[PDB]
């Protein structure tokens, strides 16, 4: 019953519109708890879950200062990459960063991550061992050499194996009621004639937390990988998620089909049938 | 809680 802490950073240059915009959000599992937006009036890290509102004024001041420093480095980094790739100050560009840690059910470190992207594509990433880097192209290899020379890898690892685990523990305790819940999916199936020969069967999963879930179709017990549409898991907005999988079936053969739902909240997998 | 901004210039 592992858990996760993740921060997501987005820095975007706006040629023609002042400084870049810097945004960051922090999550525990699939629950967001903090946000920063340099466009907002606060100029402060702000709470987005009730169990972080406990944190005192020094936490908020310290998080704001680390965000302000991160943003200045992202600003410089947008300029450097522009030069690396012979781009112009007239173009808008995007730097994205994700890092965080996973802990087992005992609260102990399982794994850590840090990955950086430029204009929606991998730029540099910390490898699983938290000791070495993968550079996506020749520009990023320049960054790799710099980062090795200052032992950035150990710098991230110390955070990921240490402060990250410790904060994740504290937040799980302080928000124990809501973060330690597993809401199983409420499921049903709809049926929509397309033709007089075809109908859409749609298998629905609602109200589930956390978001991870698998919805598979079978035909006569054989996995149906053939006209199986499948939308992106989506938020309900109340802290739960929704997903559906649909297949097109020959009218009259609706009963040859089953929908199988696998979720963490389900003692064993559900099988649904149109009947 | 955030990592410390540092050692991350490209």
């Amino acid at each position: 019953g592992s858990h996760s802490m993740r921060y997501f950073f987005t820095s975007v240059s706006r040629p023609g519109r002042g400084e870049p915009r810097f945004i960051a959000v922090g999550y525990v599992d699939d629950t967001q708890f903090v946000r920063f937006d340099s466009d907002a009036a606060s100029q402060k890290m702000e709470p987005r879950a009730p169990w972080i509102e406990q944190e005192g004024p020094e936490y908020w001041d310290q998080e704001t200062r680390n965000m302000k420093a991160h943003s200045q480095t992202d600003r410089a980094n947008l300029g450097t990459l522009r030069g690396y790739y012979n781009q112009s100050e007239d173009g808008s560009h995007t730097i994205q960063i994700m890092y965080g840690c996973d802990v087992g059910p005992d609260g102990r470190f399982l794994r850590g991550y840090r990955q950086d992207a430029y204009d929606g594509k991998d730029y540099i990433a910390l490898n699983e061992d938290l000791r070495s880097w993968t550079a996506a192209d020749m520009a990023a290899q320049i960054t790799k050499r710099k980062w090795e020379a200052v032992h950035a890898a150990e710098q991230r690892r110390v955070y990921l194996e240490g402060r990250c685990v410790d904060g994740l523990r504290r937040y799980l305790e302080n928000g124990k009621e809501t973060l330690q819940r597993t809401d199983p999916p409420k499921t049903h199936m709809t049926h929509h004639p397309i033709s007089d020969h075809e109908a859409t069967l749609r298998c629905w999963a609602l109200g589930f937390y956390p978001a991870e879930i698998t919805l598979t179709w079978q035909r006569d017990g054989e996995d149906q990988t053939q006209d199986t549409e499948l939308v992106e898991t989506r938020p309900a907005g109340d802290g739960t998620f929704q997903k559906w999988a649909a297949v097109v079936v020959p009218s009259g053969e609706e009963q040859r089909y089953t929908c199988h739902v696998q979720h963490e909240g389900l003692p064993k997998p559900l099988t649904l049938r149109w009947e | 809680i955030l990592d410390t901004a540092g050692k991350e210039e490209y």
Partner: T-cell receptor, first 118, second 112 residues
Framework: MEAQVTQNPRYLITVTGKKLTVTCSQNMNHEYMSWYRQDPGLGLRQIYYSMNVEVTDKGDVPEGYKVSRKEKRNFPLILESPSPNQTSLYFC???????????????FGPGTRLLVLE | AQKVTQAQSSVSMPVRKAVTLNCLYETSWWSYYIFWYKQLPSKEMIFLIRQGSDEQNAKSGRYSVNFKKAAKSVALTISALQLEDSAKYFCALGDTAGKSTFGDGTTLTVKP
């Protein structure tokens, strides 16, 4: 390549209200630099610190002081209008990153003895 | 509040023995470091060691920290005292973003 933080001046006697600047520099490409003042018998009180180029933050006793951080090498301490109670021993410190690893060092300059007099 | 307390203003111990310099702190910070510094009679300041709030007891050469987090107590112990260890020793607290708070220090005289 010998690591060191340099402060200039190391000793200064000055008259109240005459603007002055104490320079601090390091050639190790360190991100983190900090200013402190130590009154006799006491510990170091943080004045301003800089996590990197163009990033500054107030310490506990910023009043009557300003800093800037236009480049990694330099972190000057500016006293717009020195007063007698700014008489103190001033230290500039630097480290490669703002929260050093176990094996990394916090470097200190030699100190600046500032005396502000009528 | 934010206060670091070194309650012994001064301490003396014979050469070749060990000494423990106490440091207690109050802070609402829950992620932090503790720094120990040595100030020579010349007033030169020197970093000795830092203790992480999530780490085991820091140790380096003749220095070791007895980090007692629930008690907010981080005593520094110096073993095998030398005359060169006579100096004023400072205990300091720092956050995750470069801020720091100093105690007012403890003067150590090693007696030959």
């Amino acid at each position: 390549m010998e690591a060191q933080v340099t402060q200039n001046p190391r000793y200064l006697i000055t008259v109240t209200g005459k603007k002055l600047t104490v320079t601090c520099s390091q050639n190790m490409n360190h991100e983190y630099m900090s200013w402190y003042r130590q009154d006799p018998g006491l510990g170091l009180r943080q004045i301003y610190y800089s996590m990197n180029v163009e990033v500054t933050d107030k310490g506990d006793v910023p009043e009557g002081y300003k800093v800037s951080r236009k480049e990694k090498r330099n972190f000057p301490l500016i006293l717009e209008s020195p007063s007698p109670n700014q008489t103190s021993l001033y230290f500039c410190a630097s480290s490669l990153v703002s929260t050093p690893l176990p094996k990394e060092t916090q470097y200190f300059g030699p100190g600046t003895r500032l005396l502000v007099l009528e | 509040a934010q206060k670091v307390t070194q309650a012994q203003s001064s301490v003396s111990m014979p050469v070749r023995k060990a000494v423990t310099l106490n440091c207690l702190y109050e802070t609402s910070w829950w992620s932090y470091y503790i720094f120990w510094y040595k100030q020579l009679p010349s007033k030169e300041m020197i970093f000795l060691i830092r203790q992480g709030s999530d780490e085991q007891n820091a140790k380096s050469g003749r220095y070791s920290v007895n980090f007692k987090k629930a008690a907010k107590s981080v005593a520094l112990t110096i073993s095998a005292l030398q005359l060169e260890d006579s100096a004023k020793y400072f205990c300091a607290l720092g956050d995750t973003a470069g801020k720091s708070t100093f105690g007012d220090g403890t003067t150590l005289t090693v007696k030959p």
